[PDB]
Symmetry: D2
Subunit: 312 residues, 4 copies
Amino acid sequence: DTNIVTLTRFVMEQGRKARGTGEMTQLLNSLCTAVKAISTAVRKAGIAKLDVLSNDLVINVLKSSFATCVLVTEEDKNAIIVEPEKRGKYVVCFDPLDGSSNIDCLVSIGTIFGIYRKNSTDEPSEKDALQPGRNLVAAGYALYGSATMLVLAMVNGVNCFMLDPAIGEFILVDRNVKIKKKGSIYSINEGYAKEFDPAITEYIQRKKFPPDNSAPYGARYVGSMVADVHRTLVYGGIFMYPANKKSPKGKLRLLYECNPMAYVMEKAGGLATTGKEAVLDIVPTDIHQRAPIILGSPEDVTELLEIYQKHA
Amino acid sequence: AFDTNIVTLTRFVMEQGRKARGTGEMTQLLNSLCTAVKAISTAVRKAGIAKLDVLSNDLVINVLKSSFATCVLVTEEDKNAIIVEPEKRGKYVVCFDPLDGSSNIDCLVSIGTIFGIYRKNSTDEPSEKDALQPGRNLVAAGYALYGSATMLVLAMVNGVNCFMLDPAIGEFILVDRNVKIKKKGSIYSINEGYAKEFDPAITEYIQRKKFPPDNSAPYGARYVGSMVADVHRTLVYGGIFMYPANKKSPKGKLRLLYECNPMAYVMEKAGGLATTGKEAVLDIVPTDIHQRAPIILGSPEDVTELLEIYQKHA
Amino acid sequence: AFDTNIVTLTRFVMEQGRKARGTGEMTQLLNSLCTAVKAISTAVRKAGIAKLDVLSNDLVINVLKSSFATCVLVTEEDKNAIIVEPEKRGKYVVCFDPLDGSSNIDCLVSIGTIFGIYRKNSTDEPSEKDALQPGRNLVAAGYALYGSATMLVLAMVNGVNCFMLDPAIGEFILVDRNVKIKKKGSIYSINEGYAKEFDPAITEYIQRKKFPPDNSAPYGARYVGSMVADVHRTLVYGGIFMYPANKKSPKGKLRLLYECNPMAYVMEKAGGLATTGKEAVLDIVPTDIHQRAPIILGSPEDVTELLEIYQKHA
Amino acid sequence: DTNIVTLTRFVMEQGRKARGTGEMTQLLNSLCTAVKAISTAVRKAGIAKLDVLSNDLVINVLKSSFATCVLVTEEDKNAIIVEPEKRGKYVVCFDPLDGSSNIDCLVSIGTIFGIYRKNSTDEPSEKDALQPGRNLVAAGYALYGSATMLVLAMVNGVNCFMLDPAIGEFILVDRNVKIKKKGSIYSINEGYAKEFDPAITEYIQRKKFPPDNSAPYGARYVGSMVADVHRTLVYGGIFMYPANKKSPKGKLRLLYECNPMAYVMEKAGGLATTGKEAVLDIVPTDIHQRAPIILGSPEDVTELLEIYQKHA
Ligand SMILES: O=P(O)(O)OC[C@@H]1O[C@H](COP(=O)(O)O)[C@@H](O)[C@@H]1O
Ligand SMILES: O=P(O)(O)OC[C@@H]1O[C@H](COP(=O)(O)O)[C@@H](O)[C@@H]1O
Ligand SMILES: O=P(O)(O)OC[C@@H]1O[C@H](COP(=O)(O)O)[C@@H](O)[C@@H]1O
Ligand SMILES: O=P(O)(O)OC[C@@H]1O[C@H](COP(=O)(O)O)[C@@H](O)[C@@H]1O
Ligand SMILES: [Mn+2]
Ligand SMILES: [Mn+2]
Ligand SMILES: [Mn+2]
Ligand SMILES: [Mn+2]
Ligand SMILES: [Mn+2]
Ligand SMILES: [Mn+2]
Ligand SMILES: [Mn+2]
Ligand SMILES: [Mn+2]
């Protein structure tokens, strides 16, 4: 296409409006390079762990960005503090590559990231990453399925870019995404049926055997958080990974899995609650803490939230 | 890196269908399916930047004809099974669903091109009867999955071999020989939105997987909601996949001819059963090319743990 | 865009070598040359980010063997013509230069894989004698060029067809049917560094192109210095390409077997002459697989404007 | 590769040292996108003028860069003045796609560009592009052959990046390039033999029939200025497109063909003269004016330059 709106033409053009320095653009342009390379690695990761190439790749692209200063990765015990020569104003938490076990079965997998601004004056530290999700300035994920997709939610909107492999560019395809109010799909690992709390297990029922002699909801669960969330965003519906007895605090880690999706979700007009509070309003105490997550089309998540304090 | 001895699926079917002296007709039919499968992957990868199943149907048909190895073709997307013109004829009957999941592209879920192949068992002029053979008479079946990679799985009489597209040289390269499914699994895949309409045999089974009586751990639910995807996760990780019938789709949803059957063949050559619930899917005599069938496939000790339950109900 | 009726060279040679009833053996040999040609293009494109001709030699040989359509193979890079093992034999003799220009990669000049093919004309056990046939007995010759595109040119008995690699679906797609060279040209291509050692026939000709006596405009000099490149610019734009002999390379530089001959065949099927200077390159009886020959190819009215001059000197 | 040095990681990292604004990086990152897309267009421009897609593409990427303000293209009668909303400090002259007729014969073709800094205070104008080549701050070319190559010469050096099609990134492969002093190749269209001036036609002789009973030079002429120049830079030698009677002012246009190559050449230690003066020292009077060009390994160009005033 001639006037190809790249992700970069787009992030640089909205960045100009903050009367800024250019680091968001640098950040994202460098992140994009980790994403292409991981997409390429996964499109032939069967012709002859991966997590780590993907990981070392993302730290690398992001140090060199000259836009980072704290980096919180799924894979490292401690946060990574960017060397001074190369420090900048942003904080990025990220899961580099999600559902890596699911690549043997050819499950659509992805990289999820959340960017914060270091607002305080002292030496960069974990504390700076201990901000509530509400506070994020940018988030999204890159999906690796039939096509490689980058959904990017910033203050102005949630947008979708698809990588065009012919030119090695991410191109803008869906603009200012909004989720459907109510929709026909619930998504949850029904294998934990004996584990679930009553609120959920009533709701499941209400969708299979709908009291108003209606059409039941369909069941979906790819088992790769990014595929299910991206489905919930484009087609509407709900996704749940509620706490259960195998995992009372939730499974999906907060800083790099829940809070990005949550942000992307609310920015399109969905909700994401733990059933007891907004995901984005949680103040993290540990950079590796988990959360319950119910996200999706408002009326449904709501239908659930009422069932929560219809059972309170 | 850069490898002088690549196994393209052309070379590998040529070492099945040539030591067997069969003229390697098969090979040019399979080669041709690869050109089609490859173009559907490209188009899909750039999907959202450029119906797709009509055009993939037209594609598959055109390449198929030109293999000079077909006489009848059945599509999901076509009424009358296409009797190949004479000039280009050959002995095989190919059955196919060119773009399985056409809906699911929008949500970026893996989808695929399934295919079944027969050999015409008659001395005559082709007709869709030449196609109405059961699975036990399939010479080869397979499918190509458009996932985070484009993997072709091809099962002939020896067993199943996966092949994966190396997008750089554009050849399906061999990555797994003589595949055998896990014997028992830990995943049941089924659309529980239909909970209500399930026949009791199925329903007792879902509760036996969720709430094991013999105090093990509950099976993990999965369900991409794309047949290609759920079969393949079943083939490699084991697991049971069930699309039984309900009343809404009273004799099930999946067409026998080019869905339940090519899968069920791939399945059984890998040590996996495949049944309707009463009889095996590979022995039903097929009467309408678009005749539907229930199908339960996957690891033998689960298909069986469910057939007992089905037997225990009639 | 996205086209349901693609002409892959597999489909096109199958409509030359099948209406002719010849078993389409040829086709699996050509198919196999495409896997090799494709991997050499990828490796070359990423060249400077990862000998290449040894590995392309090993590649071509391996794919070749596995077509089950060869019995003798000659390489530029090998001494003894490779007599294919029995299990995998077939009737063709293939002659090749797997990576012509191995030197020139460094300077990013287009280079290519040339090939000549024969049919074994004997009732025996293969030997490099089965290879020592002249060009008039070539069943098909071609070359693939690794340029700004990867174009395969294939000339069989009907004429020449160019094919170009569509890197997305990874298939050589047909782009020019039954090619015919320009009759007269305006380009002479030759390494004038060798000015001094040129035989007088050649020298009078270079002055006739630079300084036309019959007051036209001077021919444009060209010369990539890669045989594949200069032949192809000659094939399409016309022009005369000359690597005559000098004393330094006293019976010329280009090996007959798999350089002068496959080119000269491609050339003549496109209405272009090809000679050593005395005799046509396609009728020399080949005695050593590495036997060299001068070659002048290109548009007929120029080859001729030079053969007159050669005749006028002896 | 994990720590993949992209062209952008490289231009941003040396740009930081000018204590700058970030426009060189923006400029080049946007130019790179026109180059990938033209490379892709040419690698299948036979499966079914081009100049113009290539052209409109480059203007577009470069307006949107927010780094341009005057653009001088081979293809436009007048310079292009970047709209204010989008103007920046740089001036780019470029031939978008060179030797377009040569794509039918599969000749290695390319895009050549030269970047200037607008130093004056008034409305951007042609005059700003009327600077001597000496003055350039950045130049190079992108080659489209077996591989797509981007040679980029800035104040610190001439460097070579090759596009890795697997990731859509230009990666750095040759560092701080230097040409060989003397070498074995002359390159010139010998078809103009009756046209050439004595200086040249003596030199040609001296190389074919070398007076010191030496090895003669080899002849090369791909007929696509970028392939011949890139050969002359990597392997050493000389390239000439001298003035002749069909073209007394030279053929190769100055602002966008001669002066970039010339700059790249001198930065690697070669020379480029018109036989009567340095190419880079010419002060252009018209943005479309041509030059004689002799560039290459010093001793040879010199051997020629002496023959020039051995004949003066
Ligand atoms: O290893 P990751 O990156 O944490 O990815 C696995 C995640 O963990 C979940 C697995 O939970 P289940 O037990 O419900 O399968 C998946 O849905 C998510 O993708
Ligand atoms: O429309 P297709 O190409 O037949 O593919 C969709 C199929 O139809 C099923 C959908 O059934 P549900 O009603 O359970 O979603 C999928 O599982 C299968 O892939
Ligand atoms: O080394 P190769 O693979 O034989 O290729 C080089 C060939 O050798 C010739 C070089 O001859 P010059 O001495 O005239 O350069 C080229 O024109 C041909 O392509
Ligand atoms: O059309 P462009 O971009 O100007 O490219 C053609 C150029 O013009 C020269 C042609 O000159 P000759 O007359 O010597 O072929 C080529 O060498 C150069 O690439
Ligand atoms: Mn992960
Ligand atoms: Mn994770
Ligand atoms: Mn379908
Ligand atoms: Mn179907
Ligand atoms: Mn060679
Ligand atoms: Mn050679
Ligand atoms: Mn041009
Ligand atoms: Mn030009």
